[PDB]
Amino acid sequence: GAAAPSESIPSVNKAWVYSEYGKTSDVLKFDPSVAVPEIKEDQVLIKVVAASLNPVDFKRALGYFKDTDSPLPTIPGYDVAGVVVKVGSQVTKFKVGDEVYGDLNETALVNPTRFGSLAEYTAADERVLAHKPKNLSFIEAASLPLAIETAHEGLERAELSAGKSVLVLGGAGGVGTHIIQLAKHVFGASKVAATASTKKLDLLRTLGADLAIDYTKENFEDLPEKFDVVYDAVGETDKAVKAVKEGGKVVTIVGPATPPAILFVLTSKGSVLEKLKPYLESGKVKPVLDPTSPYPFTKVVEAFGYLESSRATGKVVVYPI
Numbered sequence: 001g002a003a004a005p006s007e008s009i010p011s012v013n014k015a016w017v018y019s020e021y022g023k024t025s026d027v028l029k030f031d032p033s034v035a036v037p038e039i040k041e042d043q044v045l046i047k048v049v050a051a052s053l054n055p056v057d058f059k060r061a062l063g064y065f066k067d068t069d070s071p072l073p074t075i076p077g078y079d080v081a082g083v084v085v086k087v088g089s090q091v092t093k094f095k096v097g098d099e100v101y102g103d104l105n106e107t108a109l110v111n112p113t114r115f116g117s118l119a120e121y122t123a124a125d126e127r128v129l130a131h132k133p134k135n136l137s138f139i140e141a142a143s144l145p146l147a148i149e150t151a152h153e154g155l156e157r158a159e160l161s162a163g164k165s166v167l168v169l170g171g172a173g174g175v176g177t178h179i180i181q182l183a184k185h186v187f188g189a190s191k192v193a194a195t196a197s198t199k200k201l202d203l204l205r206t207l208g209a210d211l212a213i214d215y216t217k218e219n220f221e222d223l224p225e226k227f228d229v230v231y232d233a234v235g236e237t238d239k240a241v242k243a244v245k246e247g248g249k250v251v252t253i254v255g256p257a258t259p260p261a262i263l264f265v266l267t268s269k270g271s272v273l274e275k276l277k278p279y280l281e282s283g284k285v286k287p288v289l290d291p292t293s294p295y296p297f298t299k300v301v302e303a304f305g306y307l308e309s310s311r312a313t314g315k316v317v318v319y320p321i
């Protein structure tokens with residue numbers, strides 16, 4: 001991992017950019033010559049191979065977090081997988097040539113970077129990155145960080161531990177697919193129940209749900225069964241609180257949270273990915289890609305349009321970048 005030659009790293013590159021808040025179909029444009037970010041001393045520069053989309057990307061571009069956002073214009077994309085090309089002077093965990101992945105923004109809603117992952121190169125804090133598992137493709141790795149870390153953090157906040165039951169609202173999306181897998185295979189849940197629509201129930205069962213509930217045919221909150229943990233990934237805490245055992249815990253990632261449910265926003269940490277590495281290498285926890293993935297870098301508007309439909313099954317990934 002000797003430094004790259006300095007003239008080998010470009011100062012401009014191709015990226016997707018918006019200059020004003022709005023719908024992605026209106027405001028997201030391709031720019032052939034956007035500055036490559038300069039790295040801070042605790043950052044690395046990554047040659048991007050693949051990036052995932054997350055709902056936060058479009059919600060941020062609508063302006064919903066403007067009061068604590070970074071200045072426009074913005075190059076979107078939180079999730080990245082790629083190869084290190086430059087390391088800052090305080091970096092110790094990575095060298096040039098390492099294959100890495102992570103969610104760029106430590107605090108999703110507070111000062112996310114101006115220079116996201118929908119670009120040929122991006123700058124990332126050492127602390128948000130992990131080494132890419134050798135058995136995962138760059139597409140598979142890029143799909144993981146924001147979603148898997150949100151799933152993990154929510155289950156820790158709900159104090160899930162061996163033998164307990166959990167109900168997942170929204171089992172078939174980017175986050176929910178990892179809630180199911182982590183609950184069963186990492187947290188040792190005795191019973192995992194999850195909601196989705198009719199055609200998605202077999203997927204939930206394949207990922208580790210013992211009980212797949214069709215929300216289009218029945219109301220989970222009216223079941224007599226109550227759970228030690230309820231993890232809402234849809235935004236229906238009013239109902240979620242009716243499905244929890246006395247003394248159990250309800251967490252949500254879509255507010256506002258009706259007490260006793262709590263809302264949190266994840267903290268992005270490479271250490272969480274490193275903790276999960278053995279499950280990813282063994283295949284006990286798998287990436288889940290939407291069948292439309294990958295989208296070429298020319299088709300980022302379309303990729304957002306599909307994510308914005310609320311129907312994605314697992315992750316929407318952009319490759320090759």
Ligand SMILES: NC(=O)C1=CN([C@@H]2O[C@H](COP(=O)(O)OP(=O)(O)OC[C@H]3O[C@@H](n4cnc5c(N)ncnc54)[C@H](OP(=O)(O)O)[C@@H]3O)[C@@H](O)[C@H]2O)C=CC1
Pocket residue numbers: 054055056059146147150169170171172173174175176195196197198200215233234252253254264265266307310311312313314
């Ligand atoms: N607070 C935080 O830290 C975070 C918050 N979020 C938020 O969490 C939410 C989920 O994110 P993510 O998983 O990436 O989103 P996705 O867009 O990937 O979720 C799509 C899935 O949602 C399912 N879904 C939609 N409505 C329902 C419903 N009523 N019941 C059950 N399933 C439903 C769909 O299944 P079907 O077609 O069967 O309806 C589809 O498979 C988003 O609002 C996002 O902004 C995400 C990450 C972190």
Ligand SMILES: CC1=C(O)C(=O)[C@@H](C)O1
Pocket residue numbers: 054055056057059108109253254255265266
């Ligand atoms: C990551 C993230 C989202 O997707 C949200 O909507 C806010 C609550 O934070």
